[PDB]
């Protein structure tokens, strides 16, 4: 399994055309704030292909 290729599953809004966003910021998918800490409804934006 090669995991060197990563895609962004989660983002707060859609990208603009020809826009590159390389920010590894935690994503708030729920009501409880994350404050940069992983947990419930706080998922890493980058996930690897299997």
């Amino acid at each position: 399994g090669n995991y060197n290729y990563r895609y962004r599953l989660f983002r707060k809004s859609n990208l603009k055309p020809f826009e590159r966003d390389i920010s590894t910021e935690i994503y708030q998918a729920g009501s409880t704030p994350c404050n940069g800490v992983e947990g419930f409804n706080c998922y890493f934006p980058l996930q690897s292909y299997g």
């Binding site: 998918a29 729920g30 009501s31 409880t32 419930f40």
Partner: protein, 50 residues
């Protein structure tokens, strides 16, 4: 109910506030395989099988 005789609850003819169910912290697993969790309060479906 037991898993071999799982009850099938039909939810229809009503308004569902999935945000209230989503924001409860006691749920340790909330995984959607065909829809988006944040779009449950916007989409409309014929009936729901529980």
């Amino acid at each position: 109910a037991s898993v071999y005789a799982w009850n099938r609850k039909r939810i229809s003819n009503c308004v569902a506030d999935y945000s209230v169910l989503y924001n409860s912290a006691s749920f340790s697993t909330f995984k959607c395989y065909g829809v988006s969790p944040t779009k449950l309060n916007d989409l409309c479906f014929t009936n729901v099988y529980a």
